[PDB]
C-alpha cells in the first residue's frame, strides 16, 4: 500500500557472538557461556526493531551472493523485513564480525571484517519507487552519494501535499568530516555520543546547542548518551530530555543505538510528540539492554 | 551414502570446531569496535584436522564426533566434504551448540587471545559407539576427551579383535593432548599412544626421551608410545626398549604451525597403516608436519 512502509538504508553484517563472564585479558584463553549467530548492522538492526514494534519495513543495503548472505536473507524474512530493494553485488564479500559480549555489564567488543563490497549508490537509489514509503531513514556512510538520494526525496516531496510528504531521518554515527554535510538534510537528525565527544562536546545538551545551527529549517536534532538517557531539540528552542530506563542487570548492549533510533522513528511516525518519542526510545532500548538479542522487546 | 569396502578406512573420533580467526593491528579495548586486517573461518579440532591430512595423503577416512543441527554444523560438514572426509558416523545431538571459537591474533607481536567454545554439546558416548559397525575400519584413532566413556569404546574394539584373524584386526591409536588427570588412564589402551609435549612438560618431563622412559610403564603390552617435541623432532618407544628418534625437517620459512601435531599424528598413523616400520613412520611424520609448518593451512602437504 502507498505510504505504508519505513525504509532503512545501511549495513547488514553476520555477527558471530560469544557471551562471556569476564572480558578476556590479552594472550589468555577463556571459555564462553554461549554462542550465537545474529543478523546485525545499523539499518538491518533498526528493521528488526521496526518489525517487532508492528511497523511494515524494508531494508536497502549491499550484499554479495553466498552462504553468509543466505543466512542473513533468511533472517530478514523470518522477521518480515522486505528485502526487495537490496543491492546485490557481483564482486566482494558479505560482511561478518566477531562480537564478544560481556554478560556481567553488557559491553560489546566488535572485530569487524570489512570486505571489498561496494556501497549503495545514488544510481541504485534512483531505481527505487518511493510511493510505498512514509519514512526513509539513512545511515550516514558514503556522504556525497547519500546527499543525492536525499535531494531525490526533497524533489519528490515538492510535488506532494503536506499529508503525503515522506518523512526523512539521517544518522551521523562515525566522526568523519565527510558525514557532517548530512546534518543539513532530513526532518530528524540523530548524532551519536562518539561524534559529539570528538567534536569537543561533553554532554547531549552541549552537542545539541552546538550543532543545531547545522540542521535544516524546522528539523529535530537527537542525541542519545548511553545510561544518561537522551536529548532532543527542535525549532521552538526548547531542549527536551528523557531519563534512561536501564535494566537491573545489563547483559547485551549490542544494537542499543539502533533500537533507540527505530523506536524514536516509530513513535514519531505514529503522530506522537518529540518528548513522547524520546521517552519511548529510551524505554525500548532500555529493555533490550537486559536481554540477549531483540526477542522480548515488546 | 555409498558402499565402503570392509577394512579400508581410518576413523578419527574427536572434536570438530569452527575457528573464526581475526588478524588485528592492535588488541581491542573492551566495548570497542575495531576493523581487522583479515578474517578466516577454518574447520578445526584435533580429530577433524587429522581427517583432513589423511584425505590429502590418499587415505580413505571418516570422522566421528558430536555436532548439533544448524548453521555452524552446515559450514563444518561442507568443509569436511570439501576435503573428502566421510561424515556418516557423526553423532547428531538434540541439545547444545556446535563448537565455535574466536581467535584474535595481534599482528604487532604474535599474541593469540582465544574465546573457547562452550560445553553445552555432549561428547560422543559409549552407547553412541556401540551402534557403529566397525567392519569398514582398518585403524581407529581416538582423541582423549571423556576418558571413562572412551575406555568402554576401546574395550569394545578389543572385544571385536578377539574374534578376528591377524589380517582383520583393527589397529588402535590414542592421543593424550590435554594435561587432565582423567585422560591418563588412556595410556593403557591402544597399539600406538601419542602424548603431547604440553602433557609431558606438565608431568615434570623435560624432553621426549624423559617422557617416553617415564611413561612407558603405563602402556599396554607391546604398545608403541610416541612423543613429538616441536623443532627437536620426535621420538617413539616400543616393547624392544629401543628409543627411536627422528630429527625435524623444518621449512625454509615457518608460516603456520596450527595443526602441526594433527599432521604429525595422521602421517605416523598413515605410514604404520601402510605396513611401514616405526622408524620409517616417525621420519614420515616429521617430514609431513615439517612441510605443513611452511604452508598456510593443509593445501600443498602432498
Ligand atoms: C538511552 S538508549 C541508548 C541509545 C544509544 C546508545 C548507543 O549505542 P550504540 C550506537 O553504541 O550501539 C545506547 C543506549 N542505551 C544504553 N547504552 C549503554 N551503553 C552503551 C555503551 C556502549 N556499549 C556499552 C556502553 C553502555 C548502557 C545502557 C544501560 F543503562 F542499560 F546500562 C543503556 C540504556 N538504557
Ligand atoms: C616434529 S614435527 C611436529 C610435531 C608436532 C608439533 C606440535 O604441534 P602443536 C601441538 O603445536 O599443534 C610440531 C611439530 N613441528 C614443528 N613445530 C614448531 N612449532 C610448534 C610449537 C608451538 N609453539 C611454538 C612452536 C613452533 C616449529 C617447527 C619448526 F622447526 F619448523 F620451526 C616444527 C617443525 N618441523
Amino acid at each position: 500500500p502507498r505510504g505504508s512502509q519505513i525504509l532503512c538504508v545501511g549495513l547488514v553484517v553476520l555477527d558471530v557472538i560469544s557471551l562471556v563472564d569476564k572480558y578476556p585479558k590479552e594472550d589468555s584463553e577463556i571459555r564462553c557461556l554461549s554462542q550465537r549467530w545474529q543478523r546485525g548492522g545499523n539499518a538491518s538492526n533498526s528493521c528488526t526493531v521496526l518489525s517487532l514494534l508492528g511497523a511494515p519495513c524494508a531494508f536497502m543495503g549491499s550484499m554479495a551472493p553466498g552462504h553468509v548472505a543466505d543466512f542473513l536473507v533468511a533472517d530478514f524474512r523470518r522477521r518480515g523485513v522486505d528485502v526487495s530493494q537490496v543491492a546485490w553485488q557481483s564482486k566482494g564479500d558479505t560482511p561478518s564480525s566477531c562480537c564478544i559480549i560481556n554478560n556481567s555489564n553488557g559491553n560489546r567488543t566488535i572485530v569487524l571484517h570489512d570486505t571489498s563490497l561496494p556501497d549503495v549508490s545514488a544510481t541504485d537509489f534512483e531505481k527505487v519507487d518511493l510511493t510505498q514509503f512514509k519514512w526513509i531513514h539513512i545511515e550516514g556512510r558514503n556522504a556525497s552519494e547519500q546527499v543525492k538520494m536525499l535531494q531525490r526525496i526533497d524533489a519528490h516531496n515538492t510535488r506532494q501535499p503536506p499529508e503525503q510528504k515522506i518523512r526523512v531521518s539521517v544518522e551521523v554515527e562515525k566522526p568523519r568530516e565527510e558525514l557532517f554535510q548530512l546534518f543539513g538534510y532530513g526532518d530528524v537528525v540523530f548524532v551519536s555520543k562518539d561524534v559529539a565527544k570528538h567534536l569537543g562536546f561533553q554532554s547531549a545538551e552541549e552537542a545539541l546547542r552546538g550543532l543545531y545551527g547545522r540542521v535544516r529549517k524546522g528539523a529535530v536534532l537527537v542525541c542519545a548518551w548511553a545510561e544518561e538517557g537522551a536529548d532532543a531539540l527542535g525549532p521552538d528552542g526548547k531542549l527536551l530530555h528523557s531519563d534512561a530506563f536501564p535494566p537491573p542487570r545489563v547483559v547485551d548492549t549490542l544494537g542499543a543505538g539502533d533500537t533507540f533510533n527505530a523506536s524514536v522513528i516509530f513513535s514519531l511516525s505514529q503522530g506522537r510528540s518529540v518528548q513522547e518519542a524520546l521517552r519511548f526510545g529510551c524505554q525500548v532500548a532500555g529493555k533490550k539492554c537486559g536481554l540477549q538479542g531483540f526477542d522480548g522487546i515488546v
Side-chain angles (χ1 to χ4, degrees), chain A:
Chain A
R2 92 170 83 263
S4 76
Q5 267 182 345
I6 299 170
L7 174 66
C8 295
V9 188
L11 254 132
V12 63
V13 183
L14 182 140
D15 293 323
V16 193
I17 288 156
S18 303
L19 183 63
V20 296
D21 248 348
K22 33 196 95 287
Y23 185 74
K25 303 158 183 42
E26 192 195 345
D27 200 51
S28 69
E29 205 172 69
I30 66 157
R31 199 164 285 272
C32 69
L33 303 175
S34 59
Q35 308 147 24
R36 274 214 310 288
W37 274 32
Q38 254 180 31
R39 174 177 46 83
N42 44 32
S44 151
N45 275 355
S46 287
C47 283
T48 299
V49 174
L50 288 167
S51 71
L52 289 170
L53 292 171
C57 73
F59 167 81
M60 183 165 195
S62 298
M63 308 195 68
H67 294 282
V68 165
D70 281 347
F71 171 91
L72 295 175
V73 163
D75 193 273
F76 266 132
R77 295 209 151 114
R78 179 175 68 90
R79 301 293 207 177
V81 183
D82 180 315
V83 293
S84 66
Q85 307 305 315
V86 161
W88 290 92
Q89 310 287 345
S90 41
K91 48 100 158 180
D93 231 62
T94 310
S96 68
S97 79
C98 258
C99 302
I100 307 170
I101 308 174
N102 190 340
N103 196 46
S104 73
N105 61 23
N107 289 343
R108 45 107 192 91
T109 305
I110 305 170
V111 180
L112 189 54
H113 173 33
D114 190 3
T115 54
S116 175
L117 219 65
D119 269 313
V120 172
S121 71
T123 63
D124 294 344
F125 194 76
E126 120 196 320
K127 306 154 60 70
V128 177
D129 187 340
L130 305 172
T131 58
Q132 75 197 247
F133 311 105
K134 63 197 294 179
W135 196 292
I136 299 171
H137 177 69
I138 307 174
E139 308 275 12
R141 183 155 171 92
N142 52 333
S144 50
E145 286 296 287
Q146 298 179 321
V147 160
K148 303 177 177 164
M149 312 178 197
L150 289 156
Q151 292 166 335
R152 179 169 180 249
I153 308 168
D154 290 338
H156 173 275
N157 294 29
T158 60
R159 307 181 281 261
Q160 312 301 322
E163 70 270 4
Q164 304 268 295
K165 290 172 173 269
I166 307 172
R167 288 127 130 192
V168 179
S169 57
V170 163
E171 183 203 45
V172 177
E173 154 78 32
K174 303 286 201 70
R176 299 168 203 188
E177 213 220 9
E178 189 201 19
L179 303 182
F180 305 159
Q181 62 188 305
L182 301 167
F183 284 129
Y185 295 89
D187 297 298
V188 179
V189 181
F190 298 97
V191 48
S192 78
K193 172 176 166 175
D194 177 25
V195 166
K197 282 174 84 61
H198 274 259
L199 292 175
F201 303 120
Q202 309 284 66
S203 69
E205 173 270 320
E206 277 195 19
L208 299 189
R209 296 293 189 194
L211 289 172
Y212 194 77
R214 301 198 187 182
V215 314
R216 119 245 190 274
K217 180 185 180 176
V220 173
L221 183 62
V222 188
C223 189
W225 212 261
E227 32 274 295
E228 295 295 305
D231 283 13
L233 181 55
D236 68 5
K238 182 65 181 184
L239 180 73
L240 305 176
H241 174 71
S242 167
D243 261 27
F245 295 62
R249 287 171 203 109
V250 191
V251 301
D252 178 25
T253 66
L254 170 64
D258 298 326
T259 310
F260 171 82
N261 289 358
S263 307
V264 170
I265 286 168
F266 183 67
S267 208
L268 289 176
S269 85
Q270 293 287 87
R272 298 296 296 261
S273 70
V274 178
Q275 180 63 260
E276 281 161 349
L278 235 197
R279 282 300 249 158
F280 183 73
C282 294
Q283 180 195 321
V284 183
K287 182 165 203 176
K288 185 265 154 302
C289 290
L291 297 170
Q292 291 303 318
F294 302 100
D295 287 321
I297 249 68
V298 266

